[PDB]
Amino acid sequence: HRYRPGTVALREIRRYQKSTELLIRKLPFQRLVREIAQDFKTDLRFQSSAVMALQEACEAYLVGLFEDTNLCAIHAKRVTIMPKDIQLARRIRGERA
Amino acid sequence: PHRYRPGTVALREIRRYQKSTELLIRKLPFQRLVREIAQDFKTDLRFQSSAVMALQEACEAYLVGLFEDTNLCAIHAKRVTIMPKDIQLARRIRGER
Amino acid sequence: RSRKESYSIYVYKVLKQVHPDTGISSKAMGIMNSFVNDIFERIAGEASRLAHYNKRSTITSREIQTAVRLLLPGELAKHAVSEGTKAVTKYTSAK
Amino acid sequence: SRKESYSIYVYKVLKQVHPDTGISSKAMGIMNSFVNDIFERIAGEASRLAHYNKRSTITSREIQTAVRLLLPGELAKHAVSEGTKAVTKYTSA
Amino acid sequence: TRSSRAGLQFPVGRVHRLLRKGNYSERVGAGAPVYLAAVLEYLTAEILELAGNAARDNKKTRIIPRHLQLAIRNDEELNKLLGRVTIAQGGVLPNIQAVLLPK
Amino acid sequence: AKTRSSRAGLQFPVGRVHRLLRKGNYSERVGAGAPVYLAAVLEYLTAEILELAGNAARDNKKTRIIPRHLQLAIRNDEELNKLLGRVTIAQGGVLPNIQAVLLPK
Amino acid sequence: KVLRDNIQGITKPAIRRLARRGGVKRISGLIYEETRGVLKVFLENVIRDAVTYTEHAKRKTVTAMDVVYALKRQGRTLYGFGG
Amino acid sequence: NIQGITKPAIRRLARRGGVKRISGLIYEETRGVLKVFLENVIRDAVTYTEHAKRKTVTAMDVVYALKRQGRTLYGFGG
DNA sequence: ATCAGAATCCCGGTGCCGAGGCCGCTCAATTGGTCGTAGACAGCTCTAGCACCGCTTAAACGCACGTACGCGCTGTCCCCCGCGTTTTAACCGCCAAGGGGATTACTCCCTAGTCTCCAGGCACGTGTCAGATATATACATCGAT
DNA sequence: ATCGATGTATATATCTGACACGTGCCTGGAGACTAGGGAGTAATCCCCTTGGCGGTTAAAACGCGGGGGACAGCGCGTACGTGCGTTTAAGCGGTGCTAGAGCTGTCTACGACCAATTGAGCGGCCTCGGCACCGGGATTCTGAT
Incomplete structure (x- = not known):
């Protein structure tokens, strides 16, 4: 069969709002952190717990940004969050010009 | 009667109230509003004149910085008029109540 | 074999007061621990700012009370102030 | 019978930068509050850095990394340069 | 003592x-x-009392971070106290915008 | 010395x-x-800050740095504006900036 | 001498002026009541802390330093009023 | 290497956020936003680390970095 | 409606590991007892906050009218979604190397504390000039005509 | 499209309050010694990070078709802007009262400090339960029928 497009989305929403485990994968994020820290002081090291904390912080940040972005999109009568939605949410929270 | 096309006087008023810097809320009604709000916290308070002026500066700064974000929200919805849903979206994104 | 401080057993005792059968997992333990640290650092920082603002050299219960009235929001503030007054008063009641 | 401020030091810096531009009274109040704000920020950050490391003294190292934590990029680099220059000169001779 | x-x-x-x-x-x-x-x-x-109750709703006898997040974010004046605090392994409040629901 | x-x-x-x-x-x-x-x-x-403010003053052909000029100096400079983003400045006014959609055609 | 209902001292043209400074080109008619509500909430949140700093100093006069301290606490530092 | 934040992972983050329908350009924008946030936080973490004369960014460093950004993070021995 | 095909929810046996309880010990909290000083209490002084009146006059209000714009409606198209298949690289467990964090012992120098000058700074008072406005003038530009 | 005239911007003459400056005192900054404790430095242990790998499998990636949501265009009605005339109450000055901020002396309670000591707390260890889960059953969703 086939679900009317727009209901697997609500089901995934409910599934990911009952969960707590981290959504971004672990090793990709770890390599991202190490790459970004390569540009500040070469040959660093990372306590595994510190990478985990960076991931918790980043995921909480992105989740909040997408909540506010969804609010902007819904405000424009749309349903799909678009780039200008993220740009407006950040320009109002005061994160970039 | 002779008349500019609507929007022109609003444009020149934007120019004029962004050049100048004098306080915009009329002073004495703001002093009264401050005293009336303070009565609910400690009866018979006295307000240093400069303290009332500091409250007025902060409040005008906040309302101007809120109408900036409101205008951003309104333009984001392909409108020119700002409307209470815009103010409420701005204050919900900023983090206020 | 050092002695690292943390509010583990304290939060645990308050838990056993308020839910004599509910345990608490080490990660929620760490969260309660960092919450105690965060709130205590906020309150003491505001008490310090009060003291220095009025050119005093003592953080007395007056400063802690005004710190609580500044940080915690309305109802939480009133109930916390009551709880602290009661504790301090009881402390004075002893010797 | 005294009140502290930076109302004269900011004036010296002004005359050193713009040798013929006065500064109003309210603008002097603003700058006098800006210096106090940045001072409390850098000092509070240095205090946090003293405790986070179980140190006790605010050396120049602490103030330096505090300036790096607070001021954004190029202000941070230039401020650190000015600080180390002033410190080194003070150490000298 | x-x-x-x-x-x-x-x-x-x-x-x-x-x-x-x-x-x-x-x-x-x-x-x-x-x-x-x-x-x-x-x-x-x-915090622990509101947390405990939520855990009991999830018919569980052991608080975990999710329960602390549920307590801290449901209560209105604990939210305002920890408005700028992310709780590790906390998840979010189940909340789907009413415009997105089916019709 | x-x-x-x-x-x-x-x-x-x-x-x-x-x-x-x-x-x-x-x-x-x-x-x-x-x-x-x-x-x-x-x-x-x-x-x-005083250098940028003095320049902002010299722009408007005035000789005294009023608060308006401190506001222009701070806001019109990316790094200061990031350092003083949460800072109201009494009598500061705001940057003259009309949104790009509102102007007539 | 009690005062009541001065939130209508923030008149319609005053809010219109504040908006025009903010850049707004055309204001809807229900902005006035929402703006008065917003202004009153902000003012309460600031004057509560101003009065608390006062009472803790055992004074009976809200100094400008108390207002500045309250604003610095709310996260909206204000420059130009001493301290 | 930023591409490690795959399209489905950003999708999952948006689901948790409550986003129902996601455009196609949200992915690049979100990678950019995440890289900015991580730049700031890891910059402060490495600053605290360098100042402690260490070479391993520890959990307390990232916790402090986030607190300094104004995003306090409970749960890592704060 | 209905019927189905999953999706979700309930109830029960089961394993695993992590939390909750116990025990030993070392170290920080407690308790006196002493001393210095912070701060409380009062009392004087005078600044500054409040209250009020009367005028002038700028701003707020109220009203009328028109037109721009918000909003609903419709139509088209493109671009996400959902699904099935193929690929890829994350997870995990394990092992090895060794770098660096953390601790301890020793030593030195850097800063607190104190006392003794003395000049930098602040409040006072004063002279003047930068800027706001008046009056006059040259030009952009909004727009219905 | 010119008027034109409204408005903006440019030019000079005047006044005046704010500022830039010249003193007099004073108190806080600076300097010289002393002392001791905080920080540096070296040695050593051992944990914990990094790397490498092999396998498996869940997840990512890719193709595709289709439908549903974004976006543009149009119409229509309202509701916001604009202009005038009328009303209101802010702003200013001036006076007058005084409540309260602010400074100062005295003096006592209170808190730092030090030494003894004693129990509370941390860490290692171990036993039990509580959660995850698998599985079977039952109900309720979504969607074509």
Whole structure:
């Protein structure tokens, strides 16, 4: 069969709002952190717990940004969050010009 | 009667109230509003004149910085008029109540 | 074999007061621990700012009370102030 | 019978930068509050850095990394340069 | 002890040592650690009590971070106190915008 | 040179800064070079703000830095504006900036 | 001498002016009531802390330093009023 | 290497956020936003680390970095 | 409606590991006892906050009218979604190397504390000039005509 | 499209309050010694990070078709802007009262400090339960029928 497009989305929403485990994968994020820290002081090291904390912080940040972005999109009568939605949410929270 | 096309006087008023810097809320009604709000916290308070002026500066700064974000929200919805849903979206994104 | 401080057993005792059968997992333990640290650092920082603002050299219960009235929001503030007054008063009641 | 401020030091810096531009009274109040704000920020950050490391003294190292934590990029680099220059000169001779 | 003297569970001695060796002021009134330990214990009892109940709703006898997040974010004045705090392994509040629901 | 300020080539008072660091309860001790460094940083930041403000004043053909000019200096500079983003400035006004959609066609 | 209902001292043209400074080109008619509500909430949140700093100083006069301290606490530092 | 934040992972983050329908350009924008946030936080973490004369960014460093950004993070021995 | 095909929810046996309880010990909290000083209490002084009146006059209000714009409606198209298949690289467990964090012992120098000058800074008072406005003038530009 | 005239911007003459400057005192900054404790430095242990790998499998990636949501265009009605005339109450000055901020002396309670000591707390260890889960059953969703 086939679900009317727009209901697997609500089901995934409910599934990911009952969960707590981290959504971004672990090793990709770890390599991202190490790459970004390569540009500040070469040959660093990372306590595994510190990478985990960076991931918790980043995921909480992105989740909040997408909540506010969804609010902007819904405000424009749309349903799909678009780039200008993220740009407006950040320009109002005061994160970039 | 002779008349500019609507929007022109609003444009020149934007120019004029962004050049100048004098306080915009009329002073004495703001002093009264401050005293009336303070009565609910400690009866018979006295307000240093400069303290009332500091409250007025902060409040005008906040309302101007809120109408900036409101205008951003309104333009984001392909409108020119700002409307209470815009103010409420701005204050919900900023983090206020 | 050092002695690292943390509010583990304290939060645990308050838990056993308020839910004599509910345990608490080490990660929620760490969260309660960092919450105690965060709130205590906020309150003491505001008490310090009060003291220095009025050119005093003592953080007395007056400063802690005004710190609580500044940080915690309305109802939480009133109930916390009551709880602290009661504790301090009881402390004075002893010797 | 005294009140502290930076109302004269900011004036010296002004005359050193713009040798013929006065500064109003309210603008002097603003700058006098800006210096106090940045001072409390850098000092509070240095205090946090003293405790986070179980140190006790605010050396120049602490103030330096505090300036790096607070001021954004190029202000941070230039401020650190000015600080180390002033410190080194003070150490000298 | 000195926490028992005040009918507290949080250690007034430790809070004294932290108010003293923390450089918050030169002197610390002997009635300050008591007040502060009481406020900390009250807020911890509040958090743990709301947390416990949520865990009991999830028919569980063991608080985990999710339950702390549910308690902190459902209560209106605990939210405002920890409005800028992310709780590790906390998840979010189940909340689907009413416009997105089917029709 | 007697006073520490002149010995450090600054203009901000190294001594006053040392006192404020001591009777401010930021730490039990305050190293010798910490007031020097902190006063140098304060002097640099205020020199930058006053330089930009003086330029903003010279633009409008005035001679006195009023608060309006401090606001123009701070807001119109990305790095200061990031350092002073949460800072209202009394009498500051706002940057003259009409949104690009509102202008007529 | 009690005062009541001065939130209508923030008149319609005053809010219109504040908006025009903010850049707004055309204001809807229900902005006035929402703006008065917003202004009153902000003012309460600031004057509560101003009055608390006062009462803790055992004074009976809200200094400008108390207002500035309240704003610095709310996270909206204000420059130009001493301290 | 930023591409490690795959399209489905950003999708999952948006689901948790409550986003129902996601455009196609949200992915690049979100990678950019995440890189900015991580730049700031890891910059402060490495600053605290360098100042402690260490070479391993520890959990307390990232916790402090986030607190300094104004995003306090409970749960890592704060 | 209905019927189905999953999706979700309930109830029960089961394993695993992590939390909760116990025990030993060392170290920090407690308790006296002493001393210095912070701060409380009162009392004087005078600044500054409040209250009020009367005028002038700028701003707020109220009203009328028109037109721009918000909003609903419709139509088209492109671009996400959902699904099935193929690929890829994350997870995990394990092992090895060794770098660096953390601790301890020793030593030195850097800063607190104190006392003794003395000049930098602040409040006072004063002279003048930068800027706001008046009056006059040259030009952009909004727009219905 | 010119008027034109409204408005903006440019030019000079005047006034005046704010500022830039010249003193007099004073108190806080600076300097010289002393002392001791905080920080540096070296040695050593051992944990914990990094790397490498092999396998498996869940997840990512890719193709595709189709439908549903974004976006543009149009119409229509309202509701916001604009202009005038009328009303209101802010702003200013001036006076007058005084409540309260602010400074100062005295003096006592209170808190720092030090030494003894004693129990509370941390860490290692171990036993039990509580959660995850698998599985079977039952109900309720979504969607074509």
